[PDB]
Ligand SMILES: NC(=O)c1ccc[n+]([C@@H]2O[C@H](COP(=O)([O-])OP(=O)(O)OC[C@H]3O[C@@H](n4cnc5c(N)ncnc54)[C@H](OP(=O)(O)O)[C@@H]3O)[C@@H](O)[C@H]2O)c1
């Protein structure tokens with residue numbers, strides 16, 4: 001299938017990107033270098049991942065080597081929760097640009113709808129142990145994101161982990177200047193997201209699926225949690241197609257018109273995960289994979305459930 005999807009800003013976004021959350025700083029430069037060498041043109045980043053400098057080393061080198069041109073790359077980052085105030089957004093974006101070695105981002109996302117008190121700590125706490133919100137609202141943060149487009153820092157802006165009412169709030173914002181281009185949400189066979197995906201797509205917003213493999217390296221994994229990569233039912237579909245389970249899990253969102261961003265620092269898996277443009281899941285395969293939904297989240301945000309903008313109380 002086609003390698004890129006057209007966004008509502010007129011730019012094209014590669015449907016397969018490399019994730020970088022948890023990629024160790026001493027391994028992510030080589031991961032991104034390998035990814036670019038084997039065909040990746042989209043890298044998903046974030047300031048909170050604490051490895052943008054090292055991602056940037058890889059990008060800048062592959063540009064210097066003329067393995068790729070800047071206009072062929074699609075680099076995404078995200079505004080962290082402690083930078084939602086309007087006077088902090090530009091500096092947060094500019095720090096990410098400096099670290100990534102870039103003059104512009106292709107896409108900049110509000111990482112989560114929940115703003116937190118600014119300061120050095122990424123999760124400022126009171127007990128008492130609760131995260132300290134900021135009195136920022138998603139609409140004013142969105143206006144600050146729009147400014148970044150108008151200053152040339154970013155080509156596109158979007159949102160992440162917004163529920164359908166929060167997307168609707170952006171779309172209904174008084175004086176809205178730019179619609180979100182993307183909503184990046186968790187999505188895989190255990191969290192299939194039919195309602196939120198159809199809503200976003202119906203509005204021309206492209207959905208990116210994160211944790212498509214079920215994030216087996218997530219730091220809070222428990223043994224009793226379900227495991228996509230080990231699910232016999234998914235392994236059977238992979239065997240039928242002569243592909244790996246991971247390749248099925250990556251192809252699945254692609255056939256729903258989603259972008260997908262599997263993470264790896266393992267060279268052989270980085271290459272494997274890209275070899276997903278040469279086979280097709282049947283409609284029956286797709287419906288079968290959808291049937292595995294259980295509303296299970298890698299990223300549940302249990303410490304934020306009292307935040308006024310917590311996204312996961314709503315059905316979707
Ligand atoms: N917007 C948000 O709030 C948000 C939240 C979560 C994630 N994300 C983004 O989405 C990306 C992907 O999600 P994720 O990192 O949570 O998890 P994931 O991509 O679902 O899974 C990554 C894990 O799978 C392993 N793996 C990769 N390819 C494999 C293969 N072919 N066979 C077997 N194991 C394989 C990786 O191991 P190795 O690395 O050791 O190879 C790593 O342990 C993130 O890195 C981040 O960029 C965004």
Ligand SMILES: O=C(O)COc1cc(F)ccc1C(=O)NCc1cccc(C(=O)O)c1
Pocket residue numbers: 021046048049050081112113114299300301302304305307309310311
């Ligand atoms: O967020 C990601 O991309 C991947 O997870 C992380 C990565 C980090 F480097 C550091 C923390 C997290 C994390 O706890 N996320 C979940 C989260 C964060 C903020 C608010 C909510 C909420 O529920 O409002 C939920």
